[PDB]
Amino acid sequence: STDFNDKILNEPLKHSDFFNVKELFSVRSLFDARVHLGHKAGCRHRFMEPYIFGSRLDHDIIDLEQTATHLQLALNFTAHMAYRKGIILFISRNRQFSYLIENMARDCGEYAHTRYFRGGMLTNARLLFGPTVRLPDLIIFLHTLNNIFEPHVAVRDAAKMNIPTVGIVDTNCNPCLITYPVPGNDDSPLAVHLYCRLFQTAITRAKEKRQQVEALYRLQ
Amino acid sequence: DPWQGC
């Protein structure tokens, strides 16, 4: 099993961009998707200030140069977790995109939770699902806020359960406990569609790469 | 309710 570990699970960690996620997006595409449009300054969260380019007539503009690097890191992490056959759970309480996110989760062979989040789903999972239930290895937030404009409880619960989180954070969101935050607009349908496309493509590409690498290992 | 059912 040592040779298998070394060649399959440790080889991809020796490359800066193993799955070539940098070619999935650019600053131009993020701009075309309106990823830079934040909320007005009155709704600004303090911890989001380092990610804000400026305020245009009282409307926060997200710095897309930083969004590009943050998205690069988040997509790389997601691809590496999908290559390792980890359970990926998408979460979003925005009802405008529930159907889209559930379809995308079904399509990439991963999991979705867009419905009401019952207390203890993660921290009390053994009581709710069964003693041998396996929890997600990665949780992705397309929207980190619930419908009362407070953080989704899953952010804190995943932090408690030591599950890394990727998240889209708008100017009024709190990115402190998200492991791989991606500053950007989470309200425009164009932007949410772009995020779903990117994450789905990264996951499917990583899984296909895993299959190809194992096939090469067995054949050769 | 524009997103009835979700």
């Binding site: 960690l13 305020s55 890191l73 290895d137 408690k160 890394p164 | -």
Partner: protein, 133 residues
């Protein structure tokens, strides 16, 4: 299982400490990936504070030189009767044509704001753009 003190350190530091301490027999599946490609900031809980006194947020206001011109335009000729098409990435409003022509005059002549304004208006009327004051 790991520590549930989400406000002490981060998931990475807690997992690493509990692994070295021997509490956790094996590292979680994400640990090696995090170690190889860490995030730009370590996800440590911080309580957001309110700014009092002379503490102002460091966010700037996005202004450009041409904004001045735009203001004058929108104050003299008003908002153009033709509508804005924000879907078109290369949309060119009447005010934007005025701005570009004014900039061309400025770079090809002297700097007198009123003279630039009137000459730009004359040239735009020459090109065939309706401009009601």
């Amino acid at each position: 299982a790991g520590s549930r003190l989400e406000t002490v350190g981060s998931i990475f530091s807690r997992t690493r400490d509990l692994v070295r301490a021997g509490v956790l027999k094996e590292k979680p599946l994400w640990f090696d990936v995090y170690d190889a490609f860490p995030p730009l900031r370590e996800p440590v809980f911080q309580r957001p504070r309110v700014r009092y006194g002379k503490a102002k947020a460091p966010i700037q206001d996005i202004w450009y030189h041409e904004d001045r011109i735009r203001a004058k335009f929108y104050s003299v000729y008003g908002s153009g009767q033709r509508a804005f098409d924000l879907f078109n990435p290369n949309f060119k409003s009447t005010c934007q044509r005025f701005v570009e022509k004014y900039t061309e005059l400025q770079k090809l002549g002297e700097t007198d704001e009123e003279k630039l304004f009137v000459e730009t208006g004359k040239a735009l009327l020459a090109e065939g753009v309706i401009l009601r004051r």
